[PDB]
Design a protein around this ligand. Sequence first.
Ligand code: HEC
Ligand code: FE
Length: 106
Amino acid sequence: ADLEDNMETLNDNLKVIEKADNAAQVKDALTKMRAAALDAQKATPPKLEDKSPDSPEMWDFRHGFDHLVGHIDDALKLANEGKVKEAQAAAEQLKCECNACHQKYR
Ligand code: HEC
Ligand SMILES: [Fe+3]
């Protein structure tokens, strides 16, 4: 999918998590978020469309998704072990990282 769709999916699955009732629901939502984040990593953001694929901006962009996924991964662990409330908190606080990349490249 293209970058905007993947970003909508992250934003929407965050909403799924915020109102989820059990760890299985949070697990599936974080799973779809992880895939979308790595899919978004393969795109080129409009602001960087005419930079080299190997530019420092493009690698800071791509590395942001690695960093996001690392936090999703530990949130996923919590949900895998039944910690609904902690995984929800871990998930909602991803917004800090969302906003940090947005300030630079959105
Ligand atoms: C950089 C590594 C990013 C991270 C991490 C997140 N986002 Fe993002 N976002 C990024 C860019 C470069 C853009 C612009 C996309 C474009 O094509 O113009 C966006 C945009 C969004 C949007 C708007 C989507 C749209 O319809 O135009 C949303 C709703 C959004 N981003 C949400 C979002 C969330 C919830 C994130 C954390 C889970 C997140 N983003 C991370 C770059 C990056
Ligand atoms: Fe970790």
